[PDB]
Amino acid sequence: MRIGIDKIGFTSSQYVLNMKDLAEARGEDPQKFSKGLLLNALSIAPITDDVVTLAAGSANEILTAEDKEKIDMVILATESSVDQSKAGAVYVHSLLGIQPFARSFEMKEACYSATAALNYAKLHVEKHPDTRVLVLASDIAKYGIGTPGESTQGAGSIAMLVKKDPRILILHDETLAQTRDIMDFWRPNYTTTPYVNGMYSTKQYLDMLKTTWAEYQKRFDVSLTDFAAFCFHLPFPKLALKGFNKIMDKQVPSDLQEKLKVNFEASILYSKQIGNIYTGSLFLGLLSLLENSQNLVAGDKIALFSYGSGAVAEIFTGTLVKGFKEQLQTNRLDKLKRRTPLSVENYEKIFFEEAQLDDKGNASFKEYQTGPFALKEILEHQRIYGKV
Numbered sequence: 001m002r003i004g005i006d007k008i009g010f011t012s013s014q015y016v017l018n019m020k021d022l023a024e025a026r027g028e029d030p031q032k033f034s035k036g037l038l039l040n041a042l043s044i045a046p047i048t049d050d051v052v053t054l055a056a057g058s059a060n061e062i063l064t065a066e067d068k069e070k071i072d073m074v075i076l077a078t079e080s081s082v083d084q085s086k087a088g089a090v091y092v093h094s095l096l097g098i099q100p101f102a103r104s105f106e107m108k109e110a111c112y113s114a115t116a117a118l119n120y121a122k123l124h125v126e127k128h129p130d131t132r133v134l135v136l137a138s139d140i141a142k143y144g145i146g147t148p149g150e151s152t153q154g155a156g157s158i159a160m161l162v163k164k165d166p167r168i169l170i171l172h173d174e175t176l177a178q179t180r181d182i183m184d185f186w187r188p189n190y191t192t193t194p195y196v197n198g199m200y201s202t203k204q205y206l207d208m209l210k211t212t213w214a215e216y217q218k219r220f221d222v223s224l225t226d227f228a229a230f231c232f233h234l235p236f237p238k239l240a241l242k243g244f245n246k247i248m249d250k251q252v253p254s255d256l257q258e259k260l261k262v263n264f265e266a267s268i269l270y271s272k273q274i275g276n277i278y279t280g281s282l283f284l285g286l287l288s289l290l291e292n293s294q295n296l297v298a299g300d301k302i303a304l305f306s307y308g309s310g311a312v313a314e315i316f317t318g319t320l321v322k323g324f325k326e327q328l329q330t331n332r333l334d335k336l337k338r339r340t341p342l343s344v345e346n347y348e349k350i351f352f353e354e355a356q357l358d359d360k361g362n363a364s365f366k367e368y369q370t371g372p373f374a375l376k377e378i379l380e381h382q383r384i385y386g387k388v
């Protein structure tokens with residue numbers, strides 16, 4: 001029984017901050033961003049485009065009426081939640097008109113949780129092969145003005161439809177996760193922006209990659225040469241490049257070294273324009289890879305390294321399905337160029353806007369550019385979402 005990713009949708013916000021503009025405002029060498037981080041631009045979200053609206057937009061990209069009839073589980077992976085009790089998935093379920101007899105909930109573990117969502121989705125469909133599962137990985141990476149992380153901000157959501165006989169990627173059962181209790185990045189309840197030790201996080205990302213991959217190879221009798229591409233979590237592309245270099249070695253034959261490198265470069269193309277999207281970043285890289293590699297074919301295997309701060313890592317794999325290109329888009333870079341560039345001044349005002357509640361819990365918002373769904377208002381503490 002083949003189970004996996006049938007369709008992948010992606011939505012980002014409608015605004016962009018160009019890194020050269022941020023560099024100019026902050027007195028930074030623009031090459032720190034273009035070469036140091038390997039970032040060109042970041043998506044910026046207004047207050048009316050949040051985890052829920054981005055998630056619903058990404059699903060709207062891919063779902064058919066038949067999907068909506070057969071989906072019986074909706075999982076939102078996020079670290080950008082807008083309620084402490086109500087899962088953002090419930091809103092997505094509603095906004096998309098999915099059939100009522102579904103379970104809907106959120107998963108949380110920094111940038112890692114969509115990997116667990118996908119795994120549960122896969123097992124659920126295997127048990128109930130007539131069903132489909134919608135996994136959303138939606139986040140707004142917001143670090144704060146003047147912080148080291150300001151340059152690794154971003155916004156977006158990946159939607160993945162999981163079902164039997166998938167048209168893109170068959171998911172396999174050989175997985176390995178690792179948990180280690182650390183404080184590289186975290187976000188207490190009283191702050192909209194995380195605390196982060198960037199250098200320590202990089203070191204831990206690389207050590208969990210090294211140790212998890214070593215153990216994976218041992219348990220499952222595989223090596224680098226079994227794969228046509230390796231995808232990494234993508235908070236910024238330089239970190240993923242460090243990961244790639246960390247696990248690669250020169251015992252790989254030269255032709256495969258070249259292929260893996262070209263595929264790595266394909267995988268970071270979108271992230272260079274979008275920035276960090278937390279839970280969705282690994283999967284955005286997968287999408288970028290599939291839409292930009294010139295060498296991937298049916299039957300090629302892909303290895304994926306998921307990381308979340310705090311920290312949890314997992315390696316898993318999949319095999320490409322004949323016809324996968326039919327499910328992809330060719331003009332995504334063109335669509336990203338449509339985003340409205342913001343001055344640093346306007347980015348500061350828009351990205352860091354917070355709701356101004358009256359004593360009854362009402363808040364109103366200016367109309368900003370969004371995708372198909374928007375936060376319209378807050379009405380007596382209820383976030384009101386609708387189609388635009």
Ligand SMILES: CC(C)(COP(=O)(O)OP(=O)(O)OC[C@H]1O[C@@H](n2cnc3c(N)ncnc32)[C@H](O)[C@@H]1OP(=O)(O)O)[C@@H](O)C(=O)NCCC(=O)NCCS
Pocket residue numbers: 029031032033035036037148149150151152184185196197198199201202205235236238239309
């Ligand atoms: C990425 C981050 C650590 C950078 O912080 P920073 O103090 O502003 O920048 P750094 O001094 O660390 O330099 C970053 C990089 O660009 C560099 N750089 C600086 N000036 C440069 C220049 N003029 N030309 C080229 N590169 C330059 C570096 O040398 C470097 O890359 P390297 O690690 O390969 O050497 C920071 O944005 C951050 O902490 N973001 C959040 C990370 C996070 O969320 N981690 C959790 C999940 S893994």
